[PDB]
């Protein structure tokens, strides 16, 4: 209920205050060359970020009105998309590079995915994506992840976030034509984020089968949700 009553400015304030910290990796620094020391680094990072993500999702207006089952489903579906959009946002300022962590700045079968992530960061930089827009998109990713009075509730919350995006655009002086165009541009990037998560999830499953890189029980359980 309360999430359907927030003003656009209050929605934005809530999401901004909910933002997780940027965590550090175990990258050593060079001095070891990469192997799947790299995958080791990314999966350790993801595992620590996940605990912050779960506590962030609880602060997304509307999320805690869902059943525990539905809350679980949305995070199982959305987690890699959410990590990825975070990465892309952090990397905006670093052309041609992905700032996985402050200490772990990687440049360019992981190359296809790196290239996709780099392209997304480049798109966001081109569009001058704002932090207020970013936090709305990340909440959309959570609530839209992927595929019914409670469906109505998710839809009402999604409409409110859309309203909040448009509010931000109107505030920034965009014409109505420009607002609608920018809204569409941003939401179409979510298709690409979905794409990259799907590709990433197949790599993670492959990693699981190889048994070389250590994967946390939580990561194993997240991965298992994407297969059955």
């Amino acid at each position: 209920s309360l999430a359907l009553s927030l003003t656009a400015d209050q929605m934005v304030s809530a999401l901004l205050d909910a933002e997780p910290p940027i965590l550090y990796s175990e990258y050593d620094p060079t001095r070891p060359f990469s192997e799947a020391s790299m995958m080791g680094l990314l999966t350790n990072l993801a595992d620590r970020e996940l605990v912050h993500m779960i506590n962030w999702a609880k602060r997304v207006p509307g999320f805690v009105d869902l059943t525990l089952h539905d809350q679980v489903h949305l995070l199982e579906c959305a987690w890699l998309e959410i990590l990825m959009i975070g990465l892309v946002w952090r990397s905006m300022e670093h052309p041609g590079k992905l700032l996985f962590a402050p200490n772990l700045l990687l440049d360019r079968g992981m190359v296809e995915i790196f290239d996709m992530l780099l392209a997304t960061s480049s798109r966001f930089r081109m569009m001058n994506l704002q932090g207020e827009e970013f936090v709305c998109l990340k909440s959309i990713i959570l609530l839209n992840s992927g595929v019914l009075e409670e469906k109505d509730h998710i839809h009402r919350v999604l409409d409110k976030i859309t309203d909040t995006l448009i509010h931000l655009m109107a505030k920034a002086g965009l014409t109505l034509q420009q607002q609608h165009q920018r809204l569409a541009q941003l939401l179409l990037i979510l298709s690409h984020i979905r794409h990259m998560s799907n590709k990433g999830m197949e790599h993670l499953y492959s990693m699981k089968c190889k048994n070389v890189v250590p994967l946390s029980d939580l990561l194993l359980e997240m991965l298992d949700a994407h297969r059955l």
Binding site: I54, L68, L218, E221
Partner: peptide, 9 residues
């Protein structure tokens, strides 16, 4: 798939 459930609680 119980870890996430525990963490959400």
């Amino acid at each position: 798939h119980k870890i996430l459930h525990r963490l959400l609680q």
